[PDB]
Symmetry: D2
Subunit: 420 residues, 4 copies
């Protein structure tokens, strides 16, 4: 009906505590009368400036502005409107599209991040791929993607090289996953698998599913998509002439690092949890989370059989950088969210500093901490049945969740009583 504002009122003088006059200019333009509680304070925490009061005001713009001007006549502030309030995040699987296509699609992506590649044919490829993923509607499967003989041959080259180095120093869990794929996905030197097949495989495995895209445009919204246990992909490939170094994550990147790790139950869980943090997360909070993701997913360093092995997506997609990180001259601390919260990094050169990991569970634990540690006006949960999020803002929502929780509990109870 009327025009409501949001709390942003920091005057300059300290006298605006009861404001001593301005509650009247609030009410004379139809303010409100709730339970009042704010008096002179800051006794143990001395050195106190003016007090942050939130005199909410919802009337026509003229009256609210005139009364805020009246306050600024005696105070030194006006209640500026439009509180962003953790700007936004979706709630349901389908909604992962419009808010995120409208922010990540119908943008003409130049050939490569390096300005200009003499790959007009690649330009055709990427444009057509985009105009496949662009109009993607959730729930509908993905149309088949052809591949010419050149990306075929390069997939083959990298298949060989990588498989050649796979037993070498890689995560044995990743490696048996890869074997499972090679026998199930359709991983072969000659032929490169589609995404629909492998993604359906993964759905049976973990329920995670791929999604197609051209640009990562919002790591924020990217991490959001992953919160839904849905991974995003770019069905196009590096330049053939760029087989080993990837100037940008491609199929060789994703299909090779990400998925043949993502197959794990609890590791995929952890991956999801990362996104679950990101819901509506602030710009700099988003940056922190994405930064974590950097040192923990694309660039993740496990420890198999007591000795250290590698499990990072990009690492497990890189050929020579793979060897680089494995070598000693790159530094490896251990994983910590805070230590990674502002841990610097570059993008192109062979990254050196790393956060070694020993247990996916431990990663989950530090995530739980930092996320809980991440301030939040709310909380969220993911329902598996609906595949959608569970808004957690009230004791009542918690009750709603734990109801079904206890349901499954007694289910296990009856099951156990039955067994034996």
């Amino acid at each position: 009906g009327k025009a409501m504002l949001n709390l942003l009122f920091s005057p300059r003088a300290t006298k605006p505590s009861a404001l001593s006059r301005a509650v009247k200019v609030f009410e004379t333009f139809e303010a409100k009368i709730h339970h009042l509680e704010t008096r002179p304070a800051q006794r143990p925490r001395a050195g106190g400036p003016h007090l942050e009061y939130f005199v909410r005001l919802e009337v026509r713009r003229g009256d609210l502005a005139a009364l805020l001007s009246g306050v600024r006549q005696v105070s030194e502030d006006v209640r500026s409107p439009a509180g962003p309030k953790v700007p936004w995040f979706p709630r349901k699987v389908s909604e992962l599209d419009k808010c995120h296509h409208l922010v990540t699609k119908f943008d003409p992506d130049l050939d490569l991040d390096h300005p200009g590649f003499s790959d007009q044919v690649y330009r055709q490829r990427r444009k057509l791929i985009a105009e496949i993923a662009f109009q993607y509607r959730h729930g509908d499967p993905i149309p088949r993607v052809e591949y010419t003989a050149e990306e075929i041959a390069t997939w083959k080259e990298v298949y060989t090289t990588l498989k050649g180095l796979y037993a070498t120093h890689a995560c044995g869990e990743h490696l048996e996953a890869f074997a499972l794929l090679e026998r199930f996905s359709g991983y072969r030197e000659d032929n490169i698998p589609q995404l629909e097949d492998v993604s359906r495989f993964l759905k049976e495995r973990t329920g995670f599913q791929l999604r197609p895209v051209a640009g990562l445009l919002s790591a924020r919204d990217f991490l959001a998509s992953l919160a839904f246990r849905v991974f995003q992909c770019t069905q196009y490939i590096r330049h053939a002439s760029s087989p080993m170094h990837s100037p940008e994550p491609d199929c060789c990147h994703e299909l090779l690092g990400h998925v043949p790790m993502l197959a794990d139950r609890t590791f995929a869980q952890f991956s999801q949890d990362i996104g679950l943090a990101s819901l509506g997360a602030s710009d700099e909070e988003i940056e922190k989370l994405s930064t974590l993701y950097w040192f923990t997913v694309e660039f993740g360093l496990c420890k198999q059989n007591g000795e250290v092995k590698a499990y990072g997506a990009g690492l497990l997609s890189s050929y020579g950088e793979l060897l680089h990180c494995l070598s000693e001259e790159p530094e490896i601390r251990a994983f910590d969210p805070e230590a990674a919260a502002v841990q610097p990094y570059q993008d192109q050169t062979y990254q050196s500093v790393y956060f070694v990991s020993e247990s996916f569970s431990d990663a989950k634990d530090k995530l739980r901490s930092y996320a809980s540690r991440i301030q939040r006006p709310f909380s969220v949960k993911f329902d598996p049945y609906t595949l959608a999020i569970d808004v957690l803002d009230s004791p009542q929502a918690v009750r709603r969740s734990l109801e079904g929780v206890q349901d499954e509990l007694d289910t296990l109870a009856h099951a156990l009583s039955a067994i034996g």
Copy 2:
């Protein structure tokens, strides 16, 4: 520092919505300025009187009184202080003493509710029992209690009387309970049981334990004591000349109905829950709960093998009334707190209407139901380790409780992994 009041303000005219003048008299005597949000309302729920604004006022008594007078000059009310706020309840086992015997001790009880018995001997007995129960400090065991030959002979008489009709029509669970007692408690025709013995028997059995009580003075505090899984016990006996009908619950009453019922795990827990209702519960809510106890505990009918049986404590303590209730001429509905909420009853003659019970579980269930729909500014839980109450007023308390819950949970989980 200052003098705070509680929200009791209902004017007569409807103009006091913003109070229209009285916020000024609030602030001129040092009111407070927090977030205000309340305006004229009752659009869909039309036909509305004045609005209930909560303008708290914590200044000196003169200032608050003068400003409330200023309001009542234009409004038609004053913010009445001293909110009772669910008057009181304890928190810890030992605390069951001071505030509850300040209200239930040092009251000189005459001989009986009937004015005057010519049983000066019974007067001596009652006085001495009291001056034992009087100075009882929690945790310390109960001193031994002697019993002259007459209450002995009567205990024997009643033992016999019941024992013949005991197996008849009673709750088989209570029956085998008394079996375990007669073989363990010391229940015998000749000798009367002490109370500490059977008390220990219950602590091993269920953790419930006795407490000496002279007067029931507060069913409220009585139900409270129960909430702690502690049942106040009478250390005194009906008149010998009053063997069958007791004008008041005695050792014969409780020793025979209550304890050989309290033997059950879940039924004891249920009893406890009834107490858990009583926490600070309002006077009339207290009356409702006590009423519930009436038709549910001393006077309750079970149903063994599909045929109804007796399980009410007083019933399981009465001899002739016992025959009355099991007979057809008294009415028997089924248990329902709401149906029992204002279900009438007398006390002296043979009670007719009963709320039959199918299973203790059902009782627990509708108890949870009413307790929930029992309005309460809070909630309470019982810590089994410390035997204390668990104040439930914030998500944080719930959190700290469910923490230990999960602890025991994974304890079970590890055990399970171990077993087999």
Copy 3:
């Protein structure tokens, strides 16, 4: 390697307790040695015949048969091989095709149960629908289904009639569900809503989803399918000349009774739980559960505002039978697992006896009991993530389930700590 048998040995004489000779014919043809424990018994349970010993025998068919013959020479039985042990049930959403088409497809169904209709066009419709549903592969969506103007007009007629009687006595929850459909699904008098759209709506609602079916061939496997929260649907319609009475469930049956109820969260859960019980249930147990389904799903009688309302699928798929059941002359007992375990019924005449329902939760409860009461060699659970069944046969499986359980639990914990 060798040929193993299963325990089917019930001799006639009582001597085979230690077998007294036949352990030797077991071993001379390569018997085996676990912990030997079986002797003469049945002391308190006197009147005992021969004892059931399980001397497993895994050798070539000649040796096992010859030794069983040696036993039958002195005993009176042979260890009959190939114990089916509720021979089958699927585990994953995919397998819901192979064993399920192999059990329900490639069977040429005549026009209707009544031998012969003069509806060659209906025969064409049924054949084409089948040869759509026949080749259904899991995960792939359902191709569109056209509808000629006659089923259109009849859908319109029934839409009207039913809508004319919707407020009449129908489940108000179901009814508001239908409102959500009419505003969301595409429920309209003119047009027949497809299955894919409404089923997607349902997945958002409940996660349940449809599956095309022509022949119900196995109610057993039908209930199995629904255990996966997947309802088999018949994309065809009753005879136009048979608008009100349906000799067989059709779209007008299913879309009109089933889904406008199934949309409830907990009721859908309960429905699934039924199937979960049926998971590889035994033939007679299958009959029992299907019988239950009869009186509890298509024909279920709810109770809104304390007065009884209708909520059975077939009921709210029936037009005049719907009026029949609502009337008094058909009997309505209350829902009971056992009373419905063998409650008789016919199929054609307007059914009389009903099992009135007061709360879906109570139906859940009676299920939980009877299911648990249903003996099984094991138990099972449903994972929502993988959408697959969880086999429960060992403490270890219970453990691994409880692990994720506690995971979600601590998720709630951290959320709770965060909120507020």
Copy 4:
């Protein structure tokens, strides 16, 4: 009835797989015929000796012995009887006495472990204290214990010294615990806190309670007692001339380390779980657990504010050894169950190696770990209501426990719904 044996059979030759002859000598003396399954094996695990068959035998001693002799005539072993099988442990708070006094009491302890002390008065003190503690019956309160002025003065001396050095390097949580004592317990320089007072304070804090003991004779049974959250304590004093170094734990030891630590909730629970490990645990397993206790309870190092602080009982009971451990010249690893599983140690001089602790939670975790990987034929749990152990040997016990678990769960649920 008959005489049963236990599985102890390891022949020498490899021929005893089906025993090839000895099943007959078993059955001719009334053997038993259960389901048998074991043949020649060790195909993937080649290089195998004879097979371990469990042919039990319960007939009179003559038959079992003669048939075992017949086996040893052809095999090379006899089924040795009397399997101790984690020899014993109590179950309830009461039984903690007899099976533990019969093993740890009525033993005349000499003056000191060092043979001969000219402390005849100390001998009197120890004798009288024993003849108080020895005949203690569980649940009964503790008679008062006097102390002459000398142990009083030395108590004061150490109170001063330690309190002086308490702020130095100690656990801040422990330190505020000490403050809580000094203000509530009766911990003061001049007068020494009794045991009953502080034990009550602990039942308030945690429910832990002390118990008088002269000799620790069975660390096994000692740790068992602690599993009940009950700590055995020695109500006598070190030699006055031995104030700083104690050749043995005394009140100056226990009152100073143990109780001012146990005040923590989760640390108390952790301590309890340690005892929980000890349930019937084997001799060398007992040694392992006690060894753990050594480096983790009397001698443990915490880490407050990131810098290491002390929290070991004996450490915070030692004065000069206290100064020793905190200093650098002794080694301090971190707490690791396995690294502490067989970590060597001495007793008398100033111990060097230490297993530093970051959080009590960490200890809880590694305890859960080792306990799990501690083999046990079963599991156990502790009921708070009954204060007694919960046997875990079958799913059904798990069931009945998790039942109450879910009970408390929905208790929290109803509370949650109520709150707000």
